Amino acid sequence: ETTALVCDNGSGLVKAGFAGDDAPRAVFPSIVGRPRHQGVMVGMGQKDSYVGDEAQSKRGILTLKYPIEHGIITNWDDMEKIWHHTFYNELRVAPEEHPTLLTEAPLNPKANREKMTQIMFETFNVPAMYVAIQAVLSLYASGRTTGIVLDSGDGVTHNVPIYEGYALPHAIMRLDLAGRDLTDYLMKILTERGYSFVTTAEREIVRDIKEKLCYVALDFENEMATAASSSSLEKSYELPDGQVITIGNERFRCPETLFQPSFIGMESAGIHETTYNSIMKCDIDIRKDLYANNVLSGGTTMYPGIADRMQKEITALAPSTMKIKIIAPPERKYSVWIGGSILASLSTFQQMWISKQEYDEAGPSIVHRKCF
Amino acid sequence: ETTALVCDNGSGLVKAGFAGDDAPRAVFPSIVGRPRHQGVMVGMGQKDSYVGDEAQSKRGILTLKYPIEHGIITNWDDMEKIWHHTFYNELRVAPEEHPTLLTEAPLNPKANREKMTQIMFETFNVPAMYVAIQAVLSLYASGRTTGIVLDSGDGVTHNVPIYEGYALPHAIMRLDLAGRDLTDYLMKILTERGYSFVTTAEREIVRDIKEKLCYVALDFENEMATAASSSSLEKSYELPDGQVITIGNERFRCPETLFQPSFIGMESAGIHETTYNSIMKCDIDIRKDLYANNVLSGGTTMYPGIADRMQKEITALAPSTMKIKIIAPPERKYSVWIGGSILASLSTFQQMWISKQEYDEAGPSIVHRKCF
Amino acid sequence: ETTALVCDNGSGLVKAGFAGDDAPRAVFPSIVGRPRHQGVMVGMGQKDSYVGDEAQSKRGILTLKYPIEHGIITNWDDMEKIWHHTFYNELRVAPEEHPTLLTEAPLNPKANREKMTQIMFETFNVPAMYVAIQAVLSLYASGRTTGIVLDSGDGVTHNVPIYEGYALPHAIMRLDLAGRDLTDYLMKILTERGYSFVTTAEREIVRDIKEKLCYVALDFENEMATAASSSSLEKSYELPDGQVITIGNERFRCPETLFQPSFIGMESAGIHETTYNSIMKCDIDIRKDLYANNVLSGGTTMYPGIADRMQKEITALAPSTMKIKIIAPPERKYSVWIGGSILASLSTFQQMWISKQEYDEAGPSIVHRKCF
Ligand SMILES: Nc1ncnc2c1ncn2[C@@H]1O[C@H](COP(=O)(O)OP(=O)(O)O)[C@@H](O)[C@H]1O
Ligand SMILES: Nc1ncnc2c1ncn2[C@@H]1O[C@H](COP(=O)(O)OP(=O)(O)O)[C@@H](O)[C@H]1O
Ligand SMILES: Nc1ncnc2c1ncn2[C@@H]1O[C@H](COP(=O)(O)OP(=O)(O)O)[C@@H](O)[C@H]1O
Ligand SMILES: [Mg+2]
Ligand SMILES: [Mg+2]
Ligand SMILES: [Mg+2]
Prior knowledge:
Three copies of one chain form a homotrimer. By secondary structure, the first copy, chain A, is of the alpha/beta class. Among the domains of chain A are: 5-138 and 334-361, ATPase, nucleotide binding domain (Nucleotidyltransferase, domain 5); 179-257, CATH 3.90.640.10. Chain A has 14 helices and 16 strands. In chain A, the strands form five sheets. A five-stranded mixed beta sheet of chain A has the order 3-2-1-8-9, with helices on both faces. The first copy, chain A, has a five-stranded mixed beta sheet with strand order 12-11-10-15-16, sandwiched between helices. A two-stranded antiparallel ribbon of chain A has the order 4-5. In chain A, helix 5 (179-189) crosses helix 6 (200-213). Chains in contact: A-B, A-C, B-C. The A-B interface holds A 133, 136, 139-140, 145, 162-169, 282-288, 318-322, 343, 346, 348-349, 352, 372 and B 35, 37-44, 46, 58-61, 199, 201-202, 205, 238-243. The complex binds adenosine-5'-diphosphate (ADP) (3 copies) and magnesium ion (3 copies). Chains A, B, C: Polymerization of globular actin (G-actin) leads to a structural filament (F-actin) in the form of a two-stranded helix. Each actin can bind to 4 others. Chains A, B, C: It is found in: Cytoplasm, Cytoskeleton.
C-alpha cells in the first residue's frame, strides 16, 4: 500500500495515523475502564468496558487500568482491545490492507516483540510490520545524523548515542524514572497542605494539575528561599466539583526529582548525569559532536525551563573548552511519530518490512534477526 | 608522456605528484578503515571502507589498519585500494597514459618488487615503470655525488654509502627501528602518569602528540637531572574531548631510543653506531668524503636538536683529526620525492624504463635484472 | 620479626595473613558502605560506616563502593579504613612490630606505589615493607622458574613472561577486561528474560549468581545450537526474598567475553590472543619452555572448562609441532598469597626490605629504585 500505518504506542498515550502526514489524527490516553457498581437501570447500553476518551469522560464510575507498565505489557487482552479501538473505531481503516509501524523502548524483554508480532500477524492479518527504537525515530524527525537523544515519556527514560549513521549499543542507558513516578510523588507531597487524592480518577486530576501548573526551577535552593516568602509563587486550580486548590513550592519541587532521584527513594543518578555518562562511554574523538547535538524528546521534557537548567548542569561537568547546546523543538511531544512517518514513506526502507510469508516460515523469532 | 608520475610509497605516508615540480600535490596517511558497528540508520551511504583523510576524520568509528608493515606489504587488496585512491580520487589523472616511478627500501624480499610490477601492469595497464632506492633519490635531491644517507621513515631505517657515481652494496645496513616503535614506546611509558591509550584511534592521537611535543636532548643524564626539578620542561596538550594532558621527561625520553635501542628490548646498536659501522665497512681512501658528507633524510629525523647530538656522538667515535659535517636541510620530509622528480625528468634516465612489451616477454622477473 | 604479614590487596578481595602458613586467615570483600536513610531510632549504634562482612550483611541499607578500580586506588581514606580493619579488627596484630608485604599489578601509575609507602610509613609506622608483582609471586607459589602466568582477578589481567630467573619487561601485556566487566555484562544481558538489577545490593546478587552458576563452553556455536532446544541447560537460583530466577544460554554467554571482547564493545583481542602475542614478543630460543609452561592464576580463571577451551584456542594458533600444556592448580584463588608467603619467609629475601631509616633519607621515591 502507498500509505502505511504508523501507530506509536507509548506507556501512557496512543498516537496513530498515516505515513506522510505531519501530525497524528488519533491521539488518546491508553486506559481501559470497567464498571464497579450495581447498575440498577435497565434498557441502557450495558457495555462491558470503555476505552479512550469514552472512559476518560466517565472515569467517575469506572476503575481505569493502564495495560502498559514501564514499557512492559502486562495484560495482553487490554492491549488487543486498545489496538482494535485504534484501528476500527478511531481511524476507520482495515488493518489487512496496510502495513504497520511500531515503536518499543530499548533494553526490553525479548518476549514482548515476539508476542507483538504474533498478535499483529494472527488477530489482525496485516501484510507487513516493523518495530523501531524511539530514539532513532526521534533523530529521524529532527533531520540529523549525529547526536544523543534523551527520550522521556511516561514509563521509561533512555538514551541512544548515534554517530554518522552508526549506533553504539554499549552506551545505551535506561532508567525507570518517568512521568508516572512524578505524578505519584506529587500525590504524596500534596497531602502536606491537606489535599488528599487516592483513587485512579483523582490520579488523573493530579496528572492534569502537574501538566499545566508545574515548572522546572533553574536553581533549587534560591527558589526555595524565594518561596519561603510565599507571596509571588502560589497559584490556583479548579476541581471538577468546584473546590479551589492552591499550591506553593510544589510547582518546582515535583519536577526536580528528575535531577535528584533520592527524593523518591531511588538510588541512582539524575537525567543530566545519565546523559553525561552515556556520552563518556563512547570513544574520545566523537564526544564533541555529541556535546554539540543534544536532542530532547518525549512528553516529560515539556516542563518550562528544563533546557536552561540542563545546560548549566551539564556544563558544570563537561570541560570548560567544549560548548554545550541542547535542542528544544516546539514539537517535542510528537517527535517520535513524525520520525516514524518520515521513515515509513522513505523509498529505501520499503525493502526491510517483514512479509507474511517470511513469518510463515521463520516463525515469531523473525523479529530478533530482522529488526535489530 | 612528457610529465611522468612519481608516487613515493613509504610505510606510513603516501606522497604522489608530477615529475618536474618542487613539492607533491597529494599527501595523506596510508590507512584503510572499516566499520565495526550496527549501522541502524538507512538512506545514508553505506560505504564498505574509507581511505585517507576520509577515514582519518571518522577514525572514531572505524578500526584503522596499515597495509605496509616495516616496508613489507602484507595485504595487497588494501594496497590496490590505496593506489586507486591516489590515482583517481586524489590526483585526477589516468594511469594508463602516464609512466610511474616507485620507491622501496633496500634489502627487501624479492617477491615485493615482482608483485608490485605485476599489479601495476595488470590492474592499471601503465606503459612503463621503474623502481628505485630511497637513499639514492635523497642523494639526487641534494645535488651531490658522494656521501652516505640515513633514511629514517615510518617502518625502516637504512644506509647507502655512495662514492662518485658508484654504490657499495656490501656496506648497506638496515635496522628495523622507525617511527612506529617510537609511538609504541611513547604509549607504553605514557601510562606512568596515568594516561592510557589502547585503540588505534588513540594511537593516532599519541602520534600527533609525538610529532609536535618531543625533542632530542643533547645530553641525557644532565637533562634528567634538570627535569628532576620538574618546573621548566612540562608542557600541555589538548585532547579532542577537551581534557588536558601534561608530560615532563617523556618529551626527551621517547626520541632517545633511536640512540639507545636497549630501552625497547632490542639488543642492538643505535643509529649513530649503525652509520659509523656502515662508514667503516667501506675502503680507507674514500672515508674522508663520507665523513664530510652526511645527509639526513626521512620524517623521523625532524626532532629538534637531532643533528647537534648526532655530531657529538659521531665525533666521539671518529679519530680527532678528521672533521664531521651533517646536512640537515629544512626539507627532510619530502627529499625522497624531490629526488624522484629530479631523476624522472632527467633526459638520460628516459632509456631505463620498463616497456610493456618487455614485460610481455620477460615476465615479472625483468625487475630484478633491469632495476638493480 | 620472625613472622611477617603478607597483606595482598586485590581490586575485589582482601586476603591477609602471616608468613610461613599455607592459607590466609583473613579474607573479606573490599567494600565500604554508608547509610543513606533517616535513622529514626535512638540509642542504637550510629556507626558512620561499615567495612567488610559487617557491610556485606547490611548491604540492604547501605551503598557499597569499591575503593580500588582497575588496580588504581581512587579514594585513599577508604583504603586507610580498610587497612585499619585488616590489621586491628580482623588480624589482631599491631603493625609497628612486624614487616608487611604488598602486591600491585604492573604497568601502573607511579604515584600509587609512593603513596602506598607514604601511608604505611607515616600513619602505621611499620619498620620495613616491600611491594611485588602478582605474576612473579604466582610463579613462586607453583615452585617453577620458567613460564608465563595469566593473572585474571577483578580489575586487571596481565601477563609476565619469565625465563630462568629473569624477567622480560618488554613482553608484559595488560588488558583492563576482568571480573567487574563480566558482572556488568551479565547484568546487561539478564534483562532479556525480564529480570532487572540496578542497585549495588543487587550487583552483589548478580556477582553471586555468576560465581556459582556460569561455565565456559568449549564450543560456542554448537552450544548455542544445543541451547536452542532449551531443555538440558536451564538451571534455577534463589534470590534472598524468595522468588526463583532461571536462565538458559546466559550460563556460557557471559564467560565468553574473556575470549571475544567485541561483545562488550571493546576493540581488543581475547585473553588467549594476548597471551600468544606476549609469547611471540620474546626471543625465539625461549618460546618452547613458555609453550610448555602455562600457569593460570587469579579468581576469574575458576570457570569450569576454561583450560579445555584455552588449550584448543592456543593450539589453533601455535605451530603443530609444538606441544601445549596448561597448568590449572586446584588453588588458583590464593596462589598469589601463597607465593608471597613463600617469598617472605625465604632467608635470601631478608636483605631486600626497605628500612625506615632509608626512607627517612631517600624519601618516598625509594620504592621505584629499590623495588623494581
Ligand atoms: N505540557 C506538559 N507538561 C508537563 N508534563 C507533560 C505535558 N504533557 C505531557 N506531560 C507528561 O508526559 C507524559 C506522557 O508522555 P507521552 O507523550 O505519552 O510519551 P510516550 O508517547 O512515549 O508514552 C504524561 O505522563 C505527562 O505527565
Ligand atoms: N614534525 C615531526 N616531528 C617528529 N616526527 C615526525 C614529524 N613528522 C613526521 N614524523 C614521523 O615520521 C613518520 C612518517 O615518516 P614518512 O615521512 O612517512 O617516511 P616515509 O615517507 O619514508 O614513510 C611518522 O610516523 C612520524 O612519527
Ligand atoms: N568460583 C568462582 N567462579 C567464577 N568466578 C569467580 C569464582 N570465585 C571468584 N570469582 C571471580 O573472581 C573475582 C575476584 O578475584 P580476586 O580473587 O579478588 O582477585 P584479586 O585477589 O587479584 O583481586 C570476582 O569478581 C569473582 O567474579
Ligand atoms: Mg515518547
Ligand atoms: Mg622516507
Ligand atoms: Mg589476583
